[PDB]
Design a protein around this ligand. Structure first.
Ligand code: 2ON
Length: 268
DNA sequence: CTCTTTTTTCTCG
DNA sequence: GCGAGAAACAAAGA
């Protein structure tokens, strides 16, 4: 998932598991609990979920006053709420059992992670990761954005993907953002002019906020009812029309990543 | 059969 | 510092 999908999951969970006491925690893949599964099980068992937050693509379970469970779903981690008698599925790895149901984490590629962090260590956790601002008008300052772009010779798509200029873009929304902003994904950021940086800034916020409103893009669990996939202009649409007078979407490889763009729209 | 393709972090030169 | 490439892993497609 990317930020909009994680936010969609956050909202669904907030409605349903806040107030729930954790009765037990079980793992078939304890290795994805980076801070130690036995430690996590000992600390959280019997605690009540106070809330669910998000920072960039990270889910943050607030559990008791003094602990946070920081979860990253990476490529295709999925949460679902199931009855206590639900059968195990092949790629289920963890479950929190409540009195009237359970929260199960599944992840085909086993990339997703769990980390138990004390409450006063959450802000330092994200500072250490150098996560950039949330993609909102209030948090995403264009002035600082502009300065960082000026000082770098990185290509704009990989730099955006680093999460340091702004949080939340993955491969899908970065291709969508760059099409909307009419910027080439290999454009060197110090070549971007002010007006272009302004459109990029606004487009990032606009695309991500639109995606959130539409419940995320559901491609191929919680977060499965999204509609943003119907609004994608370029991602995964190789050879199809940009509706720009016959122009077709091209796919290239940029810093190891599949990259969908419309050449005529996105010249350097 | 092989090869490529689909978030973050790590190694190498 | 940088970029390139690969690793973690599983499954699907050419
Ligand atoms: O009108 C447009 N034409 C082209 S080619 N690319 C775009 N990106 C956002 N709007 C446009």
């Amino acid at each position: 998932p990317e930020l909009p999908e994680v936010e969609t999951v956050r909202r669904e969970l907030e409605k349903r598991i806040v107030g729930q006491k954790i009765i037990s925690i079980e793992a078939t893949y304890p290795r994805m609990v980076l801070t130690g599964f036995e430690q996590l099980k000992k600390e959280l068992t019997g605690k009540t979920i106070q809330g669910i937050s998000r920072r960039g693509k990270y889910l943050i379970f607030e559990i008791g006053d003094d602990f946070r469970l920081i979860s990253h779903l990476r490529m295709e981690g999925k949460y679902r709420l199931a009855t206590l008698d639900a059968p195990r599925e092949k790629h289920d790895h963890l479950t929190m059992k409540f009195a009237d149901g359970q929260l199960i984490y599944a992840d085909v590629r086993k990339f997703g992670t769990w980390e138990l962090i004390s409450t006063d260590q959450v802000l330092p956790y994200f500072l250490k990761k150098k996560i950039g601002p949330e993609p909102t008008y209030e948090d995403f300052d264009e002035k600082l954005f502009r300065e960082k772009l000026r000082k770098s010779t990185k290509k704009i798509k990989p730099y955006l993907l680093e999460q340091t200029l702004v949080a939340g873009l993955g491969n899908i929304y970065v291709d969508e953002v760059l099409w909307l902003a009419k910027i080439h994904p290999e454009k060197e950021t110090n070549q971007l002019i002010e007006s272009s940086i302004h459109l990029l800034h606004d487009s990032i916020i606009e695309i991500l906020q639109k995606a959130i409103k539409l419940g995320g893009s559901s491609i191929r669990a919680l977060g499965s009812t999204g509609k943003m996939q119907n609004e994608l202009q370029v991602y995964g649409k190789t050879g199809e029309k940009c509706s720009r007078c016959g122009a077709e979407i091209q796919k290239i490889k940029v810093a190891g990543r599949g990259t969908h763009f419309c050449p005529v729209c996105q010249q350097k």
